[PDB]
Design a protein around this ligand. Structure first.
Ligand code: HEM
Lengths: 498, 498, 498, 498
């Protein structure tokens, strides 16, 4: 026959022999007599306002669309479980990790970053890989990317970043002057631009890319003892990327390639897994790391900070409804249950605010009562009330002020955050001159071969070539700065294009 | 001790011996350590963006308020049951009425009409008395008033009506020029203005007023046989009104008088009931009624159209949460289950549209999934999908187009509306000159005594007195038109004020 | 150099020698000191809540996206003028047409129909061609398509139609079972499916397709005299379509092909025009047309109803801001100024309601104050007040009720709609069995050659081939019904695919 | 005649002799023929969906209401000017203060705190007194109260505070158990509870109360030199309070008393003014003040910190439209132009976030483009784009990313915030045991007479009397703690009530 994505209504149906279709209703639950013909006066007369079946249905249609995600708009989702397989209780007191063999439910959305909702899956772009955990200490969202780093170290430059990756305000076209204006003007961006224009620029579907936490977290054990960490969830399927020729074909041939693939795997019993690892950095090694340990354009070298296994991530259930379980999923970085905690990472500190900020806009004030976003494995008790589309019982008649003499919920000291000491001037510190090339240099000399170096250059120039020459000029200087051949392998190509 | 309204937290508490308060969480379900002290650097330092407990909670606070109702903003609610006690199956095939002794669940909101949310209960104003029925054929809402008529016969004049009852666009004050400008300029308004300034202008709480459907419905039996009807739900408690002296005191002494009373009745076991009656008018008597049978400024005389009993309305359960079960209740006139159906009543035809229109604005696109507004006694199956704050499973993976070969819901012919014949020119027919006084005249001569006539005059002038004299002049002419003493009992008083 | 789309920031800049950049502010208008570095305690400390520059900017970012259009989501816009060139004042009293040589300003959005915002321009799909006119009698929107017909004759089937053209509720993929389930089950759809899979399925950009009003309007002259009409705006550029091979390339090579082209034309001085024609049908010819004159699956034959010239449509100004002048443009069918007026067309009667319905959702209650949607060539005076994001002066302190003694705006009798007579039973009339093939048959025998017939078959099957065989079976029967060779040229191909 | 509030439409009219009312339109600008009669088939037929005049108008009605303010919901506004009259340029480099005689435009909303929109003006409650300044360095909002202190020192307790001042979640009534539960459980609240139940609990209208900044700001001169400050704007009209007997009468007699008065003053030429003063506290006196200088339950004694004059606040223009210029005014604390700057005040630090947070909810993402909220005296240039109801030109085609090579706006170093040093542990510091009585004690012994002390007791108990006795018990202990007679003057009264 065909692939399961395709046999969907076929199966929805096959699955009801206990048929006799339900009665077609309005949303008030009133049964409908004819839903194929509006109510008129005479067969060629006008439409009655009394056709409250027409307006019910139409009124709902005209209201189906919610704003798409400001970034990472296009994606795929699925459900499965995280299972502990080693213990790190030394490091963390978090329930999710509390005992080998433990399983917590998880949801996952894969996505690209700049394309809007009808774009093609198979484009060079970073790739979102978000994991929501339904722990007993509430949800813990780990909003990762398939890259261990990023383009920038200060959240303040993010709007701009993204603006320049999107489209011209006048033209609505993608503009290389904007792409390359930004990047060349901010070379802290070289580390990841180097990751992006390499073979991993475009994964073969979601199942063949790694997920990284990128940021540095802080893990706190049951004694008050803290350490810094990095999460890596590696693919059990391997790395597999699509050549750029392969990607052009599929972008037209199957814009949704990655959704189809993810659906089909799971459907046929071929469940993707990823192994979750943590690198750990004590507070002292942190005082000596030759770089800012909290700098998103930086990785922690594995000879120095070897990876430690934590458990597995298995994806084994497809959505029944996309809209309701993938379009409405809201991942917040700030959803950290006791034992996990943010670091001074400038980029992380702004994600603390942004995610819930846009969730209240896109979805609504109360988007945490959306079945899928509900910490259902825990028990919510607080003094928050009311607000639009308030679904639950709104916590009944329980005292809504704190504190009170009437047995309403109480705070629990064992959940206090970890005491840490900060001294300094309230000022805005430059970070543009932190080291922009070392790690980059090595990446290009020792992490990537010669084929790859020839490739990462052609791909780069293949795009760069369309900015204005000034922009080229500056772009290449920066490249030149990371390694002289990086620079002039690129100029060579650019010359020949130009 | 005190009244139950007052012993509320006292009881909420008493009711948990199985105490040990719940753990105070964030909305993600993460447990909180200190909710009385924000996170700072040093005890006199600044507030960290990392206090994602502060912003969670605050973010929810700043979002608690939804727009209040455009009219009827202030009110009380409660739950109970409708029970059949006589059969009218001759007249109607509606399930709610299907068999003596049948009980359907109902909700009820009482309200005033012009005051905004913090106004006083005990003011002269019409009074909303809405009943939502959770029938098997979906919800059936009967959005009635405590008056059998209204001020106007064309929905097009409603915005204006209401604008003039509210406040000045510049001043934000209540303006008698606007009240009396409108009313005197539109004398179709005399019938109800006469009801409003009489002793029934202000009921003693909700429990001592009648509820009326006002409009003319159409009842259709199991044979295709139709008749026109009027619903009357009379108080089993009696009529009881508060003198205007009593009402001034309470407006300051207890702005919420009616909420307190309704709460307290039910709480102490004193359950209000109302007997529901129907007047019936055949299609032929309709062709001969000396007035427009479908004219909201008109009642059907009971010697001519005696009342027929239908069942009882008992209120026996108070809300646990006001916000969630009274502020979020949405009554739509258009929620008529098979066997009940609108008439050509101009005022009714516009309510068909307006209620769901503002419900999608105030509450949201999907306000019918709000637990209390859900036709829970029925089964919703249709082709509507998606939309903001989409709570259910969004009907899964079931075919979303109609028609289809895949067993998705189907329409049911037995729910077709009733065939009726209309012939005419598509035009806008005046209705301002329909009879504006007869029924009014009688009302004032034979329905109300002498005490009452002396009273309805003083009350009228007591307010009228503050418009400009032109407005008075016209106001009184109109009154003069309904009965010469109506007019000059009023001028007499106005002279003495002026 | 390069194409003007591309030299945009280059020109924005070149255009300011009167430079010295403005001071970068917050939205409160407070000047910013460093917008590249957040405010922290110590260079490696945490982010202060006092960085109200961070949250201002971020808060705005997280809120940039509004829901996209339920259909026709992806598009291009531009401004220009309509100019009268012949007079039809016999037919219409509309100011826009009042005198040869008259020019009214117009805006225009081109779009596809099913793809979401990041889709490819160059796909087989109908094509929106909307024209907003800023007349003195208010705006007149003519929301046309590049096709004179459509798939369905009853608005009630539209949600479904569209649902089946979009994506599976479970899978989020495009599903041929849904495409072909619908269409084969509703053969009234054959007329336009035949237009769609022919060479005009994909125009070469927007400039080389015709625009049609599709529906039948009613034109009313200065005497009260009415006639029925059809609007046709033909391209002065010619017809030009892209082969399907050409379209695949460009869908990947330049998803935005049509935006780029429209931008570039106008930018370089190559202004597209279209000639507007009207077919006219008297009320009597309407009583005899061998079909329902008001049936969207039907054209009025030009030998019978020759076209009459009206004026020209010239596009000569590109947007400065896409978001603000193309994403926020709202076209409402119901925006008909005196002299133009809807017919009993079932599809038209539902568009009366739907457009403003979704505009109040997507844009907001007051989306008619969005500069571009403002009838700026007229003067708005009414009794509507208040509402969210109320921009103007809200009409000051002017009486807000109607009628009134205080000189507030008044209605004008000369704008009454045209008296017309309707007689019949209030019922829901089938329309599925109206003639589904004749016009189709001719189309295929005499309107299209042999090359074209060979092509329209291959294209059809080329897609059809992926439904389940039942669906094929039914699809082909229908085709067989319109002409036996239509049917079996298709079966032949399908056999060879299958 | 009568008061100007009352002669409003009378004047609106009188003011147009250049009459001939405008033509009544729809919002598309289409002229209306009959707005008093809907469109039907036959004079007693049903309502046509083609009455797109009905739905336009109705659709707008059903959408008029926006959520009211979470607190301070009910109020009055007006416009005028701030004028410099002494120089404090030593202290501050802010343009508003730049030179004696300077005048900046200002807006002002007065309000109460707990009542919802239809409540009575003349109730015991704190009183909002907000001032928006349209300076050249953007708007500077000074969101003050008529009290120099408040009930709490940590924003985290605010939701709760407010919850307990409002109504029961079950009952919707005002509950003294909640009022007095909170307050007695948090005695830091004694300072202001003492202010609130004294004669200043209820001002005689807005014109006879002082305005205070309450919080401690930081003033920074042109050298980088900082100092801490407190703003006091004293009434030039004097203090005048209404007895509680007077207030009961007016609450029923004229719920809007304060709006009427403010309107009428200004209208008749009687312009209220207030003199603005600043107390200054060097960073060193701050290191020695025997209390937390940044503690909202604390004033800075004037013998120690004498007041220094700054300029005058004159109110001289009433709104034309209330909705558009008072309901839609949005004051943000965070709107501080260079030279003014927040302190470590915990309560202030949370207001930084909250105001704009709820403005984006109530009004919308872009509420700063609402004419009245627009920093019109400055020039907004930034990288923020798009968002719902985006009114301006959205800044055209100007580069939307930062930084860029294309002359788009730039940041200005002279606007950097003031360098300050903080050292400490990231922890949550208690503040409940800071001194809760001293200042209170004095207040009651030396600031208030004997009449007043007898009064402040009766008023207190007069309300307290309705909590449960436990609550009383604790309440009085606290009072006892501030002065033994405070406590037992109260017990005496409570005994006699009880
Ligand atoms: C053209 C005529 C009328 C129109 C368009 C209209 C419109 C409205 C609107 C927009 C609301 C607010 C509902 C909400 O926001 O949830 C409302 C409330 C209400 N109306 Fe009407 N109104 C009309 C006349 C009447 C009449 C004649 C009655 C009495 C039979 C009535 C009874 C009510 C009641 C009881 C409520 C409050 C519902 C509740 O308690 O939730 N109205 N109306």
């Amino acid at each position: 026959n065909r692939d399961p994505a395709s046999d969907q209504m076929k199966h929805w149906k096959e699955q009801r022999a206990a048929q006799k279709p339900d009665v077609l209703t309005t949303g008030g639950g009133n049964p409908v007599g004819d839903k194929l013909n509006s109510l008129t006066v005479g067969p060629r007369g006008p439409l009655l306002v009394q056709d409250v079946v027409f307006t019910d249905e139409m009124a709902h249609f005209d209201r189906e669309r919610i704003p798409e995600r400001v970034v990472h708009a296009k994606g795929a989702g699925a459900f499965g479980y995280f299972e502990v397989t080693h213990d790190i209780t030394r490091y963390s007191k978090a329930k999710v990790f509390e005992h080998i063999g433990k399983r917590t439910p998880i949801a996952v959305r894969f996505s690209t970053v700049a394309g809007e909702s009808g774009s093609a899956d198979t484009v060079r772009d970073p790739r979102g890989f978000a994991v929501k955990f339904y722990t007993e200490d509430g949800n813990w969202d780990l909003v990762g990317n398939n890259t261990p780093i990023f383009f920038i170290r200060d959240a303040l430059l993010f709007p701009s970043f993204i603006h320049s990756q999107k489209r011209n305000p006048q033209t609505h076209l993608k503009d290389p002057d904007m792409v390359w204006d930004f990047w060349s003007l901010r070379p802290e961006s070289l580390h990841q631009v180097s990751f992006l224009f390499s073979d991993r620029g475009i994964p073969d579907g979601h199942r063949h890319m790694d997920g990284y936490g990128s940021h540095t977290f802080k893990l706190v054990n049951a004694d008050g003892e803290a350490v810094y960490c990095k999460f890596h969830y590696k693919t059990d399927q391997g790395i597999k990327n699509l050549s750029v020729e392969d990607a052009a074909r599929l972008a037209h041939e199957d814009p949704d390639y990655g959704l189809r693939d993810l659906f089909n795997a799971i459907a046929t019993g071929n469940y993707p897994s990823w192994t979750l690892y943590i690198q750990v950095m004590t507070f002292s090694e942190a005082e000596i790391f030759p770089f800012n340990p909290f700098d998103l354009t930086k990785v922690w070298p594995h000879g120095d900070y070897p990876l430690i296994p934590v458990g597995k991530l298995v994806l084994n259930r497809n959505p029944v409804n996309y809209f309701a379980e993938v379009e409405q999923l809201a991942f917040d970085p700030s959803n950290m249950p006791p034992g996990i905690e943010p670091s001074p990472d400038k980029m992380l500190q702004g994600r603390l605010f942004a995610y819930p900020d846009t969730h209240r806009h896109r979805l609504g004030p109360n988007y945490l009562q959306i079945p899928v976003n509900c910490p259902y494995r825990a028990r919510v008790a607080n003094y928050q009330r009311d607000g639009p589309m308030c679904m639950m019982d709104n916590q009944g008649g329980a005292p809504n002020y704190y504190p009170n003499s009437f047995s309403a919920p109480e705070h629990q000291p064992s959940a206090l955050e970890h005491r840490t000491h900060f001294s300094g001037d309230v000022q805005r510190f430059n970070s543009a001159n932190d080291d922009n090339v070392t790690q980059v240099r090595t990446f290009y000399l020792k992490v990537l071969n010669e084929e790859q170096r020839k490739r990462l250059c052609e791909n780069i120039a293949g795009h760069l070539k369309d900015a204005q020459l000034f922009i080229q000029k500056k772009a290449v200087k920066n490249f030149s700065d990371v390694h002289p051949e990086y620079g002039s392998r690129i100029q060579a190509l650019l010359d020949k294009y130009n």
